């Protein structure tokens, strides 16, 4: 919960002459950008402790980072930019994406195979509390709706989702096959699912040799009660 300190670090970070500009000129083109790039190196340089936390707790850090930009933004109300990081020094071979990397910032190189259709998902679900009829919004991260814990106003524990009041976002999946030039006879290359959202959607194509950076997440499949790991894409570049 001391991540409040992290917010501060980013607040300052987003004050350095160099960054302060790309931020503004980005908030300029809204909503034709949504993203602000960040060279991992500048972060490494300016405060190497934070640069480490990004790797251990991507989600939290990336949240605090976005929070800062919202604060240091007068004039243009709202505006939520996704901040993507480039040059992550934590490249990891596909085959090694096991449990230790669950929920960690990762960079994986490979070749894009199958690319699924682009479809929406709810990012901000709005619920109606069945206890007092009040409305509560809850940010979703998966395609599985997550109801509020309890209603703080009346103590209710039962909610009804109001789709017409919820906000959507574009989502897409693809297969990231590992590079062959490292295998050794007989071995049929392995692959992992990558999830691209918002503006990283419709960015990659079957064949693209790339380096996907992002958070390694996991999900248990229905029926086959087994988990499966996938990468929640943050930044992407060609090799």
Q: Nearest distance from residue 153's CB to Zn ion, in Å? A: 5
- Choose from a second copy, Zn ion, none: what does 34 bind? Cβ within 5-8 Å by kind: none
Are 174 and 232 in contact by the 8 Å Cβ rule? The answer is no
State yes or no: residue 99 binds a second copy (CB under 8 A): yes
- Choose from Zn ion, a second copy, none: what does 2 bind? Cβ within 5-8 Å by kind: none
132 annotated ligand binder = yes
123 annotated ligand binder = no
Positive or negative: CA dihedral 138, 140, 143, 145: negative
Residue 26, beta-bridge partner list: none
Q: What count of other Cβ atoms lies within 10 Å of the Cβ of residue 81?
A: 20
129 annotated ligand binder = yes
Are 107 and 162 in contact by the 8 Å Cβ rule? The answer is no
Give the range of 21-29, 50-58, 120-128, 179-187 binding a second copy by CB under 8 A.
Answer: 120-128
Give the range of 1-9, 43-51, 74-82, 122-130 binding a second copy by CB under 8 A.
Answer: 122-130
- Choose from a second copy, Zn ion, none: what does 133 bind? Cβ within 5-8 Å by kind: a second copy
Are 231 and 176 in contact by the 8 Å Cβ rule? The answer is yes
Cβ proximity to a second copy, 21 vs 155, nearer residue: 155
Exactly one of 4, 17, 78, 149 binds a second copy (CB under 8 A); that residue is 149
| 174: its two tokens | 């693809």
Are 95 and 178 in contact by the 8 Å Cβ rule? The answer is yes
Cβ proximity to Zn ion, 87 vs 131, nearer residue: 131
Q: What count of other Cβ atoms lies within 10 Å of the Cβ of residue 210?
A: 21
CA distance 16 to 9: 11
Exactly one of 93, 120, 206, 207 binds a second copy (CB under 8 A); that residue is 120
Q: What count of other Cβ atoms lies within 10 Å of the Cβ of residue 70?
A: 11
Scan for tokens 């509560």, then name that residue: 136
Residue 159, beta-bridge partner list: 129
Q: Nearest distance from residue 186's CB to a second copy, in Å? A: 11
Residue ranges in contact with a second copy by CB under 8 A: 31, 98-100, 102-103, 118-122, 128, 130-134, 143-144, 149-157, 160, 164, 168-170, 201, 218, 225-229
Residue ranges in contact with Zn ion by CB under 5 A: 129, 131-132, 151, 153-154, 156
Binding-site residue ranges for Zn(2+)? 129, 132, 151, 154
């Amino acid at each position: 919960v001391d991540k409040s300190k992290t917010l501060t670090k980013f607040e300052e970070f987003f004050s350095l002459q160099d960054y302060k500009d790309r931020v503004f000129e980005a908030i300029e083109k809204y909503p034709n950008v949504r993203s602000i790039e960040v060279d991992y190196l500048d972060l490494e340089m300016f405060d190497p402790d934070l640069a480490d936390l990004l790797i251990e707790k991507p989600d939290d850090v990336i949240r605090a980072a976005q929070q800062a930009i919202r604060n240091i933004d007068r004039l243009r109300k709202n505006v939520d930019l996704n901040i993507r990081f480039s040059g992550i020094s934590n490249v990891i071979p596909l085959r090694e994406l096991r449990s230790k990397f669950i929920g960690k910032f990762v960079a994986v190189d490979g070749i894009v195979r199958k690319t699924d259709e682009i479809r929406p998902r709810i990012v901000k679900a709005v619920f109606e509390c069945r206890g007092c009829m009040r409305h509560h919004a809850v940010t979703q991260s998966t395609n599985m709706i997550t109801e509020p814990s309890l209603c703080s106003e009346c103590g209710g524990r039962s909610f009804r989702l109001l789709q017409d009041e919820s906000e959507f976002l574009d989502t897409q999946t693809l297969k990231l096959q590992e590079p062959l030039e490292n295998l050794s006879g007989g071995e049929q290359p392995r692959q992992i699912t990558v999830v691209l959202e918002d503006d990283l959607v419709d960015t990659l194509t079957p064949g693209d040799i790339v380096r996907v950076t992002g958070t390694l997440r996991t999900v248990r499949d229905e029926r086959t009660k087994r988990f499966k790991n996938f990468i929640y894409g943050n930044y992407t570049e060609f090799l």
